[PDB]
């Protein structure tokens, strides 16, 4: 992990979890992530690839104020799994991770967001609710990650993804998109809302 250029503190967090050896997707993705480049990852669905974006994210967000990164996921289950992996990658570092998803009363989520977590993981329709209420502020969002974009499209979120990517300023934003398949509409997200991304398969 040290050789991939990860921070000393994140190497310590990973060692404390027993995460010793990077997977092939992590070796391929992490150096580019650290360089600030956008990433298009064609990868298997679920949590095996979370480290590829999550590990280098920690040193980017740690210690800062306000929401620094937004990760979109198709489901509560994946959002919660990804959030828990991010708390493991950052164990001991004090990085606050909040999950927002639909089908829950919004008040509790609003209280969590007011505490200023550094990473928000959420489902797209509920993310939009927060954006429009101004309970999720966009001013600090310098990393936007779409996890399982095709699944998000399957679940009815294509217009929500387009809205979110357009609403959040791109000038100092790193964007990553992970999907097992690339439907036409997802191709269009890459075209309109990403910066010449590096391709990882």
């Amino acid at each position: 992990f040290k050789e991939l250029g990860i921070s000393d503190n994140t190497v310590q967090s990973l060692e404390s979890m027993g995460f010793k050896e990077p997977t092939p997707i992590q070796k391929d993705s992490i150096p580019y992530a650290l360089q600030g480049i956008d990433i298009l990852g064609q990868a298997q669905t679920g949590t095996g690839k979370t480290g590829a974006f999550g590990i280098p994210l920690i040193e980017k967000v740690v210690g800062k104020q306000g929401v620094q990164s937004l990760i979109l996921a198709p489901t509560r289950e994946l959002a919660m799994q990804v959030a828990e992996q991010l708390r493991e990658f950052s164990r001991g570092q004090g990085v606050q991770v909040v999950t927002v998803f639909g089908g829950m009363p919004i008040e509790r989520q609003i209280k969590a967001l007011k505490k200023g977590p550094q990473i928000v993981v959420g489902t797209p329709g509920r993310v939009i609710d927060h954006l429009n209420r101004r309970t999720l502020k966009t001013d600090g969002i310098h990393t936007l990650i779409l996890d399982e974009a095709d699944e998000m499209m399957n679940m009815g979120f294509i217009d929500d993804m387009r809205f979110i990517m357009d609403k959040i300023p791109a000038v100092q934003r790193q964007t990553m998109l992970f999907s097992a398949t690339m439907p036409k509409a997802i191709q269009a997200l890459v075209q309109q809302f990403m910066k010449s991304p590096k391709i990882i398969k």
Side-chain angles (χ1 to χ4, degrees), residues 1-2 4-201:
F1 274 113
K2 291 180 182 189
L4 297 172
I6 292 299
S7 71
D8 288 2
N9 289 353
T10 298
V11 172
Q12 186 177 245
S13 295
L14 292 173
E15 283 187 20
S16 82
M17 290 297 307
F19 300 143
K20 307 186 170 178
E21 69 214 82
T23 64
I25 191 164
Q26 297 163 359
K27 294 186 182 168
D28 292 353
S29 304
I30 287 174
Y32 295 130
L34 295 163
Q35 294 160 35
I37 300 155
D38 286 5
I39 293 176
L40 179 55
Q42 190 169 234
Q44 289 187 323
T45 75
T47 51
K49 80 202 169 284
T50 301
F53 64 79
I55 290 163
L57 194 280
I58 299 319
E59 69 194 75
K60 194 174 180 179
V61 306
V62 67
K64 294 176 174 171
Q65 275 198 12
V67 180
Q68 295 292 311
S69 179
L70 175 62
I71 299 168
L72 307 179
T75 62
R76 177 194 179 275
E77 184 63 35
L78 186 57
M80 293 192 80
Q81 285 191 36
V82 163
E84 201 48 40
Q85 294 173 284
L86 294 170
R87 299 189 186 97
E88 294 170 350
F89 307 147
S90 62
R91 185 190 197 214
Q93 301 187 235
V95 173
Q96 292 169 306
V97 185
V98 164
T99 53
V100 301
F101 46 88
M104 305 296 282
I106 201 173
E107 62 210 306
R108 186 176 282 96
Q109 295 172 4
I110 296 179
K111 283 164 185 175
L113 289 170
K114 279 173 181 180
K115 293 193 253 266
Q118 295 73 66
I119 305 174
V120 171
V121 189
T123 56
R126 184 48 65 93
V127 162
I128 292 173
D129 208 346
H130 287 291
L131 290 174
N132 292 337
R133 295 175 173 240
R134 266 107 197 287
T135 52
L136 195 282
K137 291 178 192 219
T138 61
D139 318 281
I141 303 179
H142 291 292
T143 314
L144 174 65
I145 294 153
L146 278 65
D147 195 2
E148 320 296 10
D150 50 0
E151 292 188 7
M152 287 192 281
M153 180 179 181
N154 295 341
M155 292 173 187
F157 297 125
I158 189 67
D159 291 331
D160 297 336
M161 287 186 281
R162 299 181 60 90
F163 181 95
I164 288 163
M165 292 177 105
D166 184 60
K167 176 170 215 169
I168 299 171
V171 163
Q172 294 174 18
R173 193 187 81 200
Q174 179 175 40
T175 311
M176 311 186 182
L177 186 150
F178 291 85
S179 190
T181 67
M182 296 291 290
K184 191 177 177 196
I186 300 305
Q187 298 187 7
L189 302 174
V190 180
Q191 287 157 8
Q192 294 169 41
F193 305 117
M194 303 185 64
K195 299 176 184 180
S196 315
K198 207 73 44 162
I199 300 161
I200 290 147
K201 292 175 179 169

